Design a protein around this motif. Structure first.
Motif, PDB file in Angstrom:
ATOM      1  N   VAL A  43      -3.077   0.296   7.590  1.00 31.89           N
ATOM      2  CA  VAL A  43      -3.095  -0.379   6.298  1.00 31.89           C
ATOM      3  C   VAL A  43      -4.222  -1.402   6.229  1.00 31.89           C
ATOM      4  N   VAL A  44      -4.386  -2.169   7.302  1.00 32.95           N
ATOM      5  CA  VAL A  44      -5.429  -3.186   7.363  1.00 32.95           C
ATOM      6  C   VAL A  44      -6.814  -2.550   7.411  1.00 32.95           C
ATOM      7  N   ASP A  45      -6.986  -1.587   8.310  1.00 29.75           N
ATOM      8  CA  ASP A  45      -8.262  -0.897   8.456  1.00 29.75           C
ATOM      9  C   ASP A  45      -8.693  -0.265   7.136  1.00 29.75           C
ATOM     10  N   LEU A  46      -7.726  -0.028   6.257  1.00 30.72           N
ATOM     11  CA  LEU A  46      -8.004   0.574   4.957  1.00 30.72           C
ATOM     12  C   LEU A  46      -8.601  -0.451   3.998  1.00 30.72           C
ATOM     13  N   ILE A  47      -7.869  -1.537   3.771  1.00 34.58           N
ATOM     14  CA  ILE A  47      -8.328  -2.593   2.878  1.00 34.58           C
ATOM     15  C   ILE A  47      -9.804  -2.906   3.108  1.00 34.58           C
ATOM     16  N   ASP A  48     -10.163  -3.142   4.365  1.00 32.66           N
ATOM     17  CA  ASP A  48     -11.543  -3.451   4.720  1.00 32.66           C
ATOM     18  C   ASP A  48     -12.510  -2.503   4.017  1.00 32.66           C
ATOM     19  N   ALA A  49     -12.368  -1.210   4.289  1.00 27.13           N
ATOM     20  CA  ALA A  49     -13.227  -0.203   3.682  1.00 27.13           C
ATOM     21  C   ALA A  49     -13.574  -0.572   2.243  1.00 27.13           C
ATOM     22  N   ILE A  50     -12.565  -0.990   1.485  1.00 27.33           N
ATOM     23  CA  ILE A  50     -12.764  -1.373   0.093  1.00 27.33           C
ATOM     24  C   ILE A  50     -13.445  -2.733  -0.011  1.00 27.33           C
ATOM     25  N   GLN A  51     -12.769  -3.765   0.482  1.00 20.97           N
ATOM     26  CA  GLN A  51     -13.310  -5.119   0.446  1.00 20.97           C
ATOM     27  C   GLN A  51     -13.506  -5.666   1.856  1.00 20.97           C
ATOM     28  N   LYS A  75       2.634  -8.292   7.632  1.00 24.69           N
ATOM     29  CA  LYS A  75       2.501  -9.509   6.838  1.00 24.69           C
ATOM     30  C   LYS A  75       1.049  -9.737   6.431  1.00 24.69           C
ATOM     31  N   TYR A  76       0.141  -9.587   7.388  1.00 24.49           N
ATOM     32  CA  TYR A  76      -1.281  -9.778   7.130  1.00 24.49           C
ATOM     33  C   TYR A  76      -1.788  -8.772   6.101  1.00 24.49           C
ATOM     34  N   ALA A  77      -1.538  -7.493   6.362  1.00 24.03           N
ATOM     35  CA  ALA A  77      -1.965  -6.431   5.460  1.00 24.03           C
ATOM     36  C   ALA A  77      -1.529  -6.720   4.027  1.00 24.03           C
ATOM     37  N   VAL A  78      -0.272  -7.123   3.866  1.00 24.82           N
ATOM     38  CA  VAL A  78       0.269  -7.432   2.548  1.00 24.82           C
ATOM     39  C   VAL A  78      -0.577  -8.483   1.839  1.00 24.82           C
ATOM     40  N   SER A  79      -0.646  -9.673   2.425  1.00 23.22           N
ATOM     41  CA  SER A  79      -1.420 -10.766   1.849  1.00 23.22           C
ATOM     42  C   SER A  79      -2.764 -10.265   1.328  1.00 23.22           C
ATOM     43  N   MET A  80      -3.511  -9.587   2.192  1.00 23.71           N
ATOM     44  CA  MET A  80      -4.815  -9.053   1.820  1.00 23.71           C
ATOM     45  C   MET A  80      -4.703  -8.143   0.601  1.00 23.71           C
ATOM     46  N   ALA A  81      -3.953  -7.056   0.746  1.00 25.02           N
ATOM     47  CA  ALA A  81      -3.763  -6.108  -0.344  1.00 25.02           C
ATOM     48  C   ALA A  81      -3.609  -6.829  -1.678  1.00 25.02           C
ATOM     49  N   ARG A  82      -2.754  -7.846  -1.700  1.00 20.68           N
ATOM     50  CA  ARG A  82      -2.515  -8.616  -2.916  1.00 20.68           C
ATOM     51  C   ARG A  82      -3.670  -9.576  -3.187  1.00 20.68           C
ATOM     52  N   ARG A  83      -4.301 -10.051  -2.119  1.00 20.87           N
ATOM     53  CA  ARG A  83      -5.420 -10.977  -2.241  1.00 20.87           C
ATOM     54  C   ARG A  83      -6.553 -10.358  -3.055  1.00 20.87           C
ATOM     55  N   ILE A  84      -6.845  -9.091  -2.783  1.00 24.09           N
ATOM     56  CA  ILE A  84      -7.905  -8.383  -3.490  1.00 24.09           C
ATOM     57  C   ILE A  84      -7.430  -7.909  -4.860  1.00 24.09           C
ATOM     58  N   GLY A  85      -6.140  -8.087  -5.128  1.00 22.17           N
ATOM     59  CA  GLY A  85      -5.584  -7.675  -6.403  1.00 22.17           C
ATOM     60  C   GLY A  85      -5.406  -6.173  -6.499  1.00 22.17           C
ATOM     61  N   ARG A  87      -2.343  -4.831  -7.759  1.00 24.16           N
ATOM     62  CA  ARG A  87      -1.118  -4.679  -8.534  1.00 24.16           C
ATOM     63  C   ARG A  87       0.026  -4.187  -7.652  1.00 24.16           C
ATOM     64  N   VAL A  88       0.126  -4.751  -6.452  1.00 25.50           N
ATOM     65  CA  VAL A  88       1.175  -4.370  -5.514  1.00 25.50           C
ATOM     66  C   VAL A  88       1.965  -5.589  -5.049  1.00 25.50           C
ATOM     67  N   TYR A  89       3.263  -5.589  -5.335  1.00 30.00           N
ATOM     68  CA  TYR A  89       4.129  -6.696  -4.948  1.00 30.00           C
ATOM     69  C   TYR A  89       5.191  -6.235  -3.954  1.00 30.00           C
ATOM     70  N   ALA A  90       4.783  -5.390  -3.013  1.00 35.93           N
ATOM     71  CA  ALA A  90       5.698  -4.876  -2.000  1.00 35.93           C
ATOM     72  C   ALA A  90       5.945  -5.910  -0.908  1.00 35.93           C
ATOM     73  N   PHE A 107       0.160   2.507  -0.674  1.00 32.84           N
ATOM     74  CA  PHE A 107      -1.043   3.261  -0.340  1.00 32.84           C
ATOM     75  C   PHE A 107      -1.766   3.720  -1.604  1.00 32.84           C
ATOM     76  N   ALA A 108      -0.993   4.043  -2.635  1.00 33.00           N
ATOM     77  CA  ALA A 108      -1.558   4.495  -3.901  1.00 33.00           C
ATOM     78  C   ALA A 108      -2.288   3.362  -4.611  1.00 33.00           C
ATOM     79  N   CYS A 109      -1.589   2.251  -4.818  1.00 27.96           N
ATOM     80  CA  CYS A 109      -2.171   1.094  -5.488  1.00 27.96           C
ATOM     81  C   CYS A 109      -3.570   0.802  -4.953  1.00 27.96           C
ATOM     82  N   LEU A 110      -3.719   0.872  -3.635  1.00 27.13           N
ATOM     83  CA  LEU A 110      -5.005   0.613  -2.996  1.00 27.13           C
ATOM     84  C   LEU A 110      -6.074   1.567  -3.518  1.00 27.13           C
ATOM     85  N   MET A 111      -5.752   2.857  -3.532  1.00 29.08           N
ATOM     86  CA  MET A 111      -6.684   3.871  -4.010  1.00 29.08           C
ATOM     87  C   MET A 111      -7.280   3.471  -5.355  1.00 29.08           C
TER      88      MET A 111
END
Length: 124
Positions: A43-51, A75-85, A87-90, A107-111
């Protein structure tokens, strides 16, 4: 080969891998039920790719993640995912248990933010 695009479950997964590669990550998943999402490593390695630049591995754990670790990683992955916006409140818990109920969208929201559009050759 199955005709008709129904469910749209695999699609997401397929992307996750594509994104991870786009940058060159050593992590990848197979499904929302996979027992790898509990490590919140893919999950974390994914976010990076984007931001990129925002994801700090130095803090992210790796390898044998104990009940406590697993949670921390997510916990970390979550914060980030939401940090970049995204639309995920999981919750960071659903990730630990790898629940296909929330782990499916997480995983979808990220896409969304990622892929914006795609056009290929009509013919030939």
């Amino acid at each position: 080969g199955s005709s008709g695009s129904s469910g749209n479950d695999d699609i997401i997964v397929n992307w996750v891998n594509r994104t991870l590669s786009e940058a060159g990550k050593s992590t990848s998943i197979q499904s929302f039920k996979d027992k790898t999402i509990s490590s919140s490593l893919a999950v974390v390695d994914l976010i990076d790719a984007i931001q990129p630049g925002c994801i700090n591995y130095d803090l992210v754990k790796s390898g044998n993640l104990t009940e406590d670790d697993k949670h921390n990683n997510a916990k970390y992955a979550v914060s980030m995912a939401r940090r970049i916006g995204a639309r995920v409140y999981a919750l960071p818990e659903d990730l630990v248990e790898v629940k296909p109920k929330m782990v499916m969208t997480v995983f979808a929201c990220l896409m969304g933010r990622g892929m914006k559009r795609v056009s290929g050759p009509s013919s030939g």
